Every structure is written in structure tokens, then in C-alpha cells.
Design an enzyme around this catalytic site. Sequence first.
Site, PDB file in Angstrom:
ATOM      1  N   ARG A  63       0.856  -1.183   0.000  1.00 46.14           N
ATOM      2  CA  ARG A  63       0.000   0.000   0.000  1.00 46.14           C
ATOM      3  C   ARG A  63       0.892   1.233   0.000  1.00 46.14           C
ATOM      4  NH1 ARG A  63      -2.614   2.650   4.495  1.00 46.14           N
ATOM      5  NH2 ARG A  63      -4.572   3.662   3.901  1.00 46.14           N
TER       6      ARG A  63
ATOM      7  N   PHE B 101       2.049  10.651   1.512  1.00 43.39           N
ATOM      8  CA  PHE B 101       1.656  10.133   2.792  1.00 43.39           C
ATOM      9  C   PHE B 101       2.691   9.148   3.299  1.00 43.39           C
ATOM     10  CE2 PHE B 101      -1.742   7.299   5.062  1.00 43.39           C
ATOM     11  CZ  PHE B 101      -1.326   7.751   6.319  1.00 43.39           C
TER      12      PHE B 101
ATOM     13  N   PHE C 145       5.363   1.323   8.395  1.00 47.87           N
ATOM     14  CA  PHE C 145       5.262   2.260   7.289  1.00 47.87           C
ATOM     15  C   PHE C 145       6.403   3.250   7.448  1.00 47.87           C
ATOM     16  CE2 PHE C 145       3.090   5.866   9.689  1.00 47.87           C
ATOM     17  CZ  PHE C 145       2.573   5.171  10.787  1.00 47.87           C
TER      18      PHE C 145
ATOM     19  N   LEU D 147      -1.052  10.884  13.360  1.00 46.36           N
ATOM     20  CA  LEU D 147      -0.823   9.531  13.831  1.00 46.36           C
ATOM     21  C   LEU D 147      -0.049   9.489  15.129  1.00 46.36           C
ATOM     22  CD1 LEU D 147       0.140   7.968  10.402  1.00 46.36           C
ATOM     23  CD2 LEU D 147      -2.123   8.012  11.502  1.00 46.36           C
TER      24      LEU D 147
END
Lengths: 178, 11
Positions: free
Chosen positions: A57, A62, A115, A124
Site C-alpha cells: 500500500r 503520505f 510504514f 498519527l
Amino acid sequence: GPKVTVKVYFDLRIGDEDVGRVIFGLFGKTVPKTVDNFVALATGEKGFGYKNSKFHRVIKDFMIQGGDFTRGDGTGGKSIYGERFPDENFKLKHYGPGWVSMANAGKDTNGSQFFITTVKTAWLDGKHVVFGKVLEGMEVVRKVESTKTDSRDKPLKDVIIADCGKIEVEKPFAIAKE
Amino acid sequence: XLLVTAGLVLA
């Protein structure tokens, strides 16, 4: 800032092309257990790990997400502590591009997915455990960030961790500081 | 939206 206690390299491929090496510095004095898990999965020590798995992903501006070495789709992965383990602490934040953090499915559900941010992601902070940063290779992180994806944000060409391993640090050192 | 989850991907 925090001290790098171990480094980990990943050699990435995008489709049929060797794209380069990314080197991570991990903050083993701040989050020792989350760092031990990541390092153990990069060496393949316990018989399973990140070598040959994919980044499933990626979203431009981002982050790029990977680490699901069992299912390859976002639903799998496991840690050296069992299938999931609790949040160690939230001392470090997603300060800017190049910070590495644990993906999860809510509170205390860390496994192996992680990530790498390509922008500051302050929303986050306090929900995902940050444990390392890219020391070398930010330009190959930007090449994965720019690969074409389908409408589910999955890369059309597979982004593979072709090799990975640990690089010992004899003296922990602080990152560039302010 | 912009989350990084494992299993239920949200908006």
C-alpha cells in the site's frame, strides 16, 4: 535526538528493476522491544521475516506500507512475540519524512507491518509506535512513493524487499539535532 | 482518510 543503536538495510526492487538500498537507524534505547522485533524479522533469525515480501500500500504524499509477509495484503504478519503485541510507548513522533512506525489495527495490535512516512504525519502521533528513521536512501523511498497504484493503493508493479539484514553499531549515536 | 491500519482499511 534519540540514539541509533542498530541499523537495518533493505534492497528494493520495483517490478523488474533493482532500485537501490535504504538504511534505517533504530532507536533501541527508546523502544527496545519494537526494535528487537523489526531487527529479528530483517535477519530472518526466527525462521520468518521480511526478505522477499512486498509493500502492499503506497500513497503519494503520505507513506509507503509493508511488512505483511504471511498474507501480502494488509491482513497478515506476526511478530517474534506472538501474533500481535502491545504498544511499547509513544515517546517518538512522526516528525517528518523518513520516520518508520508500526501499522496496527487499533490499540495493542502490533505485528510485523510498518510504514515509512514521506511527509510529517502529526495525526498519527500517540496512536502508532515510531521506532526508527531512514538514514540513507530517502531517494529510493521517493521512487516507491511515486510508483503507479490501482484504486486500492496497491502498486501495479510489485515492490519487493529483495534482501535485508542488520548492520551492527559499536557506539550508539544521536541523530542531527534540533 | 489517511490512516495506516492492518485489516480494516478506513477512509
